[PDB]
């Protein structure tokens, strides 16, 4: 399973199991460019989030309820949804994912 693999590699589940995790299959430039797009509030209230104009190719990785460290199972779900990230700093760049419209 892609999730078990990527998650494993990226050190996302090499010392704990992460419930959720979205991987974007678009160029980093394109993704970073989102920081100058539709400005909306994040779930945390703060209004420094920017929804993508278009839909990106993604992969929702969910931990199935039956798994426990050191064995983290992941349900892979491919999709094409708008992303919403929280940009901060200079250069303004994505530092938090937030949702997939």
């Amino acid at each position: 399973n892609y999730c078990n693999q990527m998650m494993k590699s990226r050190n996302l589940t090499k010392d704990r199991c992460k419930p959720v995790n979205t991987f974007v299959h678009e160029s980093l430039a394109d993704v970073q460019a989102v920081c100058s797009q539709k400005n909306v509030a994040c779930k945390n209230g703060q209004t420094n989030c920017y929804q993508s104009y278009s839909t990106m190719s993604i992969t929702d990785c969910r931990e199935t309820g039956s798994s426990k460290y050191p064995n983290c199972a992941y349900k892979t779900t491919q999709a094409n949804k708008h992303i919403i990230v929280a940009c901060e700093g200079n250069p303004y760049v994505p530092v938090h994912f937030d949702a997939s419209v």
């Binding site: 990226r10 050190n11 299959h25 160029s27 993704v31 992969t59 760049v93 938090h96």
Partner: peptide
Amino acid sequence: KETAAAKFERQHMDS
């Protein structure tokens, strides 16, 4: 070591 914007790239980015 690993900035906030760097950690994003590693955790989510998979161009």
